[PDB]
Ligand binder design. Structure first.
Ligand SMILES: *OP(=O)(O)OP(=O)(O)OC[C@H]1O[C@@H](n2cnc3c(=O)[nH]c(N)nc32)[C@H](O)[C@@H]1O
Ligand SMILES: [Zn+2]
Ligand SMILES: [Zn+2]
Lengths: 408, 852
RNA sequence: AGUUGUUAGUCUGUGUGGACCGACAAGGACAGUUCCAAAUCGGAAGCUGCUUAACACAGUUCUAAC
């Protein structure tokens, strides 16, 4: 390991194509070195699942899994670091910061990257981003343990009365990406109708389905991008239609938040999707069926704006990641900022909405705006602003209704 | 109501300014200024008639549609598409149609590359045509109207007209209104009948929703249309973004002869190298067939993989944000797309074989010149430890590693004895660890055999009477002035378009004539290099296909590879001989008759050489392809016969218009600089280099060589500032900016990462000393044109360009933005220091009499 | 689609034009005492103690109204 990498004023994006021991081999040694160098260190993880994986891979070293107490190096989810930073408690001074999955899309993740970069620029930090796709990546077909046999084809969007045999005729397990649970249900119904054991995954069903996936019984697995992160398959083919959805802002007069329809995925997303296969040099049939060109200008998405809100409201003008800089207003005064943190943490409001509310200085209790919305500002309940996240799924609607009622 | 019609209405409901801006939100647009100028002037070559050329290039490049055989274009218009297509590998015959007439474009006859095979026909409406057998079809017919129904109907008529032409052939058809239902259905029926997809071209402005139906592609029409419409909607305001620019297309010149184009390679000579490459990647060696290589022989391909704005400078040079050139310099891309484009338009040519008289003349001249150049020095082999020194003292780091390694040296020895036998095993270079050892080794061998050209300064001004090797920027001015003192006509400095691509075989032979002076041991190796890796070259390049990037293997015989050691020496040599010949023709010693006859008597020419050669040589400054020549009389501005026949065509001027020569030597451009003369307080004169500052500013706002490392980017900024304080102090803006930067970075952050790659930069500013003393050393102490050696004491006797002169060279003085900047640089520095942290901070502002 | 600007003023260069010349300098810029420059004075000219023109032709001068 290049020991000079541990100098302050040094932030390095390292990488290792999926597996490779990036977590299985390198990370414990890195923490070992930092411990030997006696460095107060932080580790940032994208999601609870990845956190558990790192916990498994961190057997032996003292890590404050946010435990007993009085360690030196801590580990936590990225958004946790974001929120803890937002809360007015002086953030602990870590000398070194390791951050996994740095190509993540959570606004909290973007803001964490920005803050870490700025702290390095302050000259009192050392940063290590261990991800396979930086901002500025365009290599959607990067390295792999085994070469990936690509092919562009006619990936069907709905169920097909007949045809598309190349889909089912495979001798190997197929991992297929779908943009919504409903579409997954449809395609799974069709595949099972052809007598292929299938398995559908989603944001909620992942906990119950993942271990079943860890068994060897299944053959054809449909999923959304939840499987895009840390989901070991040992599959054979991937069908990645390069169609997806995302919560994007939309101005069109009233600036709002809309859950996008089917859409070509970002270059990095498609890269990760393709890399969800071909993680073993033993295998050969690393087939990848793509039917789209990755999106051109993701500059319209909203998580950039929300991350800007988080960074600006954070307690020197706050500045993003250099390569992500290409995408000081949203900062609010004391009481309004506290209200924003509250509405995010207590009311479970997604970041954009909470910032919009806190801009106008409505204290957490008041819910006048929840019905003061215009005629067209209705739902199928008239909030001052529209965000399909607040009413996309029935569970989301129920939670938002609870919040608007004052029950949350 | 489909989304497309929603957007159509919404657009209809806009106003002049709103529509005017909205049509240009976040789109690529090609610079058509220069082309407009050249066409208004009346040029015939190197110019896309319209913006159609780039538009079709965007498709052709991605292979979404591939011209082949006979190509028929309908609605050819001014004919951008036809001309662009003419210069492609498979294309054989191009016929373009249009109704022509009032309110309609007309073909503009030109003579860009491949013009000889283009037949454009006005006065013929495509609608009434007897569909002919087409190998490739192009159609760009569309008449937009505010009424969507009208566009839909026109589209329908178009599709009806163009159905009977698709007989299993590559095609691209414009579709103007794709968001009308009947249109969608007809497209779907045609797709089922033929296949192919529907695509949007980023060049097309926001004001329309056109797409193109193309042969090679699949997908879903409806969803794509919806995506386009959603994009446009999102782009109505979208906090409007300025449009990105790209460089226009070139189309060479001259007639295109297919039968003489492709090359037959000496497979016995390069076979071992090709075979070794194929063996090394024996998995992915897939011989392609979409290889666009006209004049380069092909060998196969194999799988392969794939600017940043320095913050420190950006924060301290705010006023230059609106400056178009400063931004333009930044938005240049080196992706495989760019490299392929450059290769297509620049290197895949073929220069005609010269007249025999020219060949004999050049032979004579080259012999004489080489004999002169060796009047005192004598070649020697180079040595390994010298190569070690050159590497160590300055891929640099890995290079040091490899040189200090051992196995590399054994590899070198083995390949070397192969060379002694007369074959070459890894001498292959790339047009940008084991294979990397091979590459570095080949460089080493070239250094060993041809390093004496540089290590011994064969071309120093003292030795070669014209070269300026080893002078550096601070002396080219003085050299130019001394030229200006010699009697004669005006001064000319003609830049040769793509010099490297313009080296015919005879030039290489002449350059090889130097082997008539080495010692057998050396001669064998030099012959090896010349005849195996210079006259038969093998190159790896990158190409993007609709699967990813792949390396392609090509080979050729001409066109010296620009990465090679000894390139500078040979370039200077060939340039010298060329200019000498041009002077000869100017003085009348050479005529057209002398060029024509296969055997012109050598006595006259040799006499002229041995009598006046050194004298003529002392009238030139030559550095690579850059030349400054002062002939005795202005007939030199007409000696274009020999120059063209040798194939060194000038840049940006018609092939027979006379040269245009300056008289004031402070205007003649040279190595991308001009030079100014200044008077100091004592009256002592200085000669300093000046270039339009915008280039300087942009080049110091680009943080290439560093992904993201503020500690690095700051040091690069400091390095740029010091170079500014050493070679450009006479520009006010530059001096202010430099002082600010130097006071805005820790006073012990030693810079690195060379600020320039020119050979004419000795890099006196990469030290860590105090500028003033080093400035004294550079310009006062060690300047031979400095009679009075009284050192300057403070940055106040240091001169300044005259106000109007500084303005004339791009300075921002006199404008309010600069004024406020000038006032508040103190806050700017404070902010940047804050960003940096707690390291020391000296203040260089009080050096100017504005901050005391 | 491509092709694309149009009219007014301003700003460059020329030409005609007696048509400007000096003195000074508020202020401005610049940071090298380095350049501009309103006012004011005087000179001259013209028609009678007031004016320093006027217009043209081209600028890839810009600014605005279709
Ligand atoms: O790209 P291009 O088609 O050359 O731009 P056009 O000027 O030709 O526009 C064609 C298309 O656009 C609409 N349009 C033109 N000019 C307009 C304007 O000033 N205001 C509005 N609202 N629309 C304008 C027109 O419908 C035409 O079909
Ligand atoms: Zn060799
Ligand atoms: Zn200049």
């Amino acid at each position: 390991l290049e020991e000079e990498m541990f100098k302050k004023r040094n932030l390095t994006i390292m990488d290792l194509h999926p597996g490779s021991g990036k977590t299985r081999k390198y990370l414990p040694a890195i923490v070992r070195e930092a411990i030997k160098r006696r460095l107060r260190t932080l580790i940032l993880a994208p999601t609870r699942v990845v956190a558990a994986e790192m916990e498994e891979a961190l057997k032996g070293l003292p890590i404050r899994y946010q435990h007993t107490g009085k360690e030196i190096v801590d580990l936590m989810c990225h958004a946790t670091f974001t929120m803890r930073l937002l809360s007015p408690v002086r953030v602990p001074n870590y000398n070194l910061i390791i951050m996994d999955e740095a190509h993540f899309t959570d606004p909290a993740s973007i803001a964490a990257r920005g803050y870490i970069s700025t702290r390095v620029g302050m000259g009192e930090a050392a940063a290590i981003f261990m991800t396979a796709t930086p901002p500025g990546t365009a290599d959607a077909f990067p390295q792999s343990n085994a070469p990936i046999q690509d092919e562009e084809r006619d990936i069907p969007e709905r169920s097909w009365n007949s045809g598309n045999d190349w889909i089912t005729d495979f001798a190997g397990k197929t991992v297929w990406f779908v943009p919504s649970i409903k579409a997954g249900n449809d395609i799974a119904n069709c595949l099972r109708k052809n007598g292929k054991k299938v398995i559908q995954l989603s944001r909620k069903t992942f906990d119950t389905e993942y271990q079943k996936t860890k068994l060897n019984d299944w053959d054809f697995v449909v999923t959304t991008d939840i499987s895009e992160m840390g989901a070991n398959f040992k599959a054979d083919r991937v069908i990645d239609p390069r169609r997806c959805l995302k919560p994007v802002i939309l101005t069109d007069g009233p600036e709002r938040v809309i859950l996008a329809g089917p859409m070509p995925v970002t270059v990095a997303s498609a890269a990760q999707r393709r890399g969800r296969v071909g993680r073993n040099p033993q295998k050969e049939n690393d087939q990848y069926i793509f039917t789209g060109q990755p999106l051109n200008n993701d500059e319209d998405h909203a998580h950039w704006t929300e991350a800007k809100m988080l960074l600006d409201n954070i307690n020197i003008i706050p500045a993003l990641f250099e390569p992500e800089r290409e995408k000081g207003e949203y900062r609010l005064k004391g009481e309004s900022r506290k209200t924003f943190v509250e509405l995010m943490r207590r009311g479970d409001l997604p970041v954009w909405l909470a910032h919009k509310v806190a801009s106008e200085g409505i204290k957490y209790t008041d819910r006048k705006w929840c019905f003061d919305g215009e005629r067209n500002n209705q739902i199928l309940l008239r909030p001052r602003w529209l965000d399909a996240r607040t009413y996309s799924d029935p569970l989301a609607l129920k939670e938002f209704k609870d919040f608007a009622a004052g029950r949350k | 109501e489909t989304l497309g019609e929603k957007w159509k209405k919404r657009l209809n409901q806009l106003s002049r300014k709103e529509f005017d801006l909205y049509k240009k939100s976040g789109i690529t647009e090609v610079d058509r200024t220069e082309a407009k100028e050249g066409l208004k002037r009346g040029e015939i070559t190197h110019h896309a008639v319209s913006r159609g050329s780039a538009k079709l290039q965007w498709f052709v490049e991605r292979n979404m549609v591939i011209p082949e055989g006979r190509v028929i274009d309908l609605g050819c218009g001014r004919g951008g598409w036809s001309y662009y297509c003419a210069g492609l590998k498979k294309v054989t015959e191009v016929r373009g149609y249009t109704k022509g007439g009032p309110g309609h474009e007309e073909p503009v006859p030109m003579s860009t590359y491949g013009w000889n095979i283009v037949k454009l026909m006005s006065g013929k409406d495509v609608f009434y045509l007897p569909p002919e057998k087409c190998d490739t079809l192009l159609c760009d017919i569309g008449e937009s109207s505010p009424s969507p129904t009208v566009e839909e109907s026109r589209t329908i008529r178009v599709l009806k007209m163009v159905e009977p032409w698709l007989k299993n052939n590559q095609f691209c058809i414009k579709v103007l209104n794709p968001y009308m239902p009947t249109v969608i259905e007809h497209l779907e029926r045609l797709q089922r009948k033929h296949g192919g997809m529907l695509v949007r071209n980023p060049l097309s402005r926001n004001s329309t929703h056109e797409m193109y139906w193309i042969s090679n592609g699949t997908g879903n029409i409806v969803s794509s249309v919806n995506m386009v419409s959603r994009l446009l909607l999102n782009r109505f305001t979208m906090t409007y973004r300025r449009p990105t620019i790209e460089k226009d297309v070139d189309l060479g010149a001259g007639t295109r002869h297919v039968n003489a184009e492709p090359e037959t390679p000496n497979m016995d000579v390069i076979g071992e190298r090709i075979r070794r490459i194929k063996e090394e990647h024996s998995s992915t060696w897939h011989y392609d067939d979409e290889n666009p290589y006209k004049t380069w022989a092909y060998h196969g391909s194999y799988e392969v993989k794939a600017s940043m704005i320095n913050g420190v400078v950006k924060l301290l040079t705010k006023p230059w944000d609106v400056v178009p050139t400063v931004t333009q310099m930044a938005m240049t891309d080196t992706t495989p797309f760019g490299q392929q484009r450059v290769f297509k338009e620049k290197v895949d040519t073929r220069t005609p074989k010269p007249m025999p008289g020219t060949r004999k003349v050049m032979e004579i001249t080259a012999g004489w010149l080489w004999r002169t150049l060796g009047r005192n020095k004598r070649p020697r082999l180079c040595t390994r430890e010298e190569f070690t020194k050159k590497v160590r003292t300055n891929q640099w780091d890995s290079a040091r590693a490899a040189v200090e390694d051992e196995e590399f040296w054994k590899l070198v020895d083995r390949e070397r004895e192969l060379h002694k036998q007369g074959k070459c095993g890894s001498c292959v270079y790339n047009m940008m660890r084991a294979i990397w050892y091979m590459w570095l080794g080949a460089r080493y061998l070239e250094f060993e055999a041809l390093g004496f050209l540089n290590e011994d300064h064969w071309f120093s001004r003292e030795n070669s009477y014209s070269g300026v090797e080893g002078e550096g920027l601070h002396k080219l001015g003085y050299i130019l002035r001394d030229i200006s003192k010699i009697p004669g006509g005006a001064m000319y400095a003609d830049d040769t378009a793509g010099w490297d691509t313009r080296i015919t075989e005879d030039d290489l032979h002449n350059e090889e004539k130097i082997t008539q002076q080495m010692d057998p041991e050396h001669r064998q190796l030099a012959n090896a290099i010349f005849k195996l890796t210079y006259q038969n070259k093998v190159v790896k390049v990158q190409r993007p296909t609709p699967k990813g990037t792949v390396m392609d293997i090509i080979s050729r015989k001409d066109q010296r590879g620009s990465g090679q050691v000894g390139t500078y020496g040979l370039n200077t040599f060939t340039n010298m001989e060329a200019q000498l010949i041009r002077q000869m023709e100017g003085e009348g010693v050479l005529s057209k008759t002398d060029l024509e006859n296969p055997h012109l008597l050598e006595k006259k020419i040799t006499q002229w050489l041995e009598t006046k050669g050194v004298e003529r040589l002392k009238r030139m400054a030559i550095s690579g392809d850059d030349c400054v020549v002062k002939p005795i009389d202005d007939r030199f501005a007409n000696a274009l016969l020999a120059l063209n026949d040798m194939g060194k065509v000038r840049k940006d001027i018609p092939q027979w218009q006379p040269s245009k020569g300056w008289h004031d030597w402070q205007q003649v451009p040279f190595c991308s600089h001009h030079f100014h003369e200044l008077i100091m307080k004592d009256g002592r004169k200085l000669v300093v280099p000046c270039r339009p500052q915008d280039e300087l500013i942009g080049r110091a706002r680009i943080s290439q060589g560093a992904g993201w490392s503020l500690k690095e980017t700051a040091c690069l900024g400091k390095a740029y500032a010091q170079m500014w304080a050493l070679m450009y102090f006479h520009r006010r803006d530059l001096r202010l900016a430099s002082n600010a930067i130097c006071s805005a970075v820790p006073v012990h952050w030693v810079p690195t990462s060379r600020t320039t790659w020119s050979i004419h930069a000795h890099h006196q500013w990469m030290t860590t000393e105090d500028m003033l003393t080093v400035w004294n050393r550079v310009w006062i102490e060690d300047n031979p044109w400095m009679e009075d050696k009284t050192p300057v004491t403070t940055w106040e006797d240091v001169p300044y360009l005259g106000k109007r002169e500084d303005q004339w060279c791009g300075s921002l003085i006199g404008l309010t933005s600069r004024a406020t900047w000038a006032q508040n640089i103190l806050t700017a520095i404070q902010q940047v220091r804050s960003l940096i942290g707690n390291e020391e901070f000296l203040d260089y502002m009080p050096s100017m009499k504005r901050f005391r």
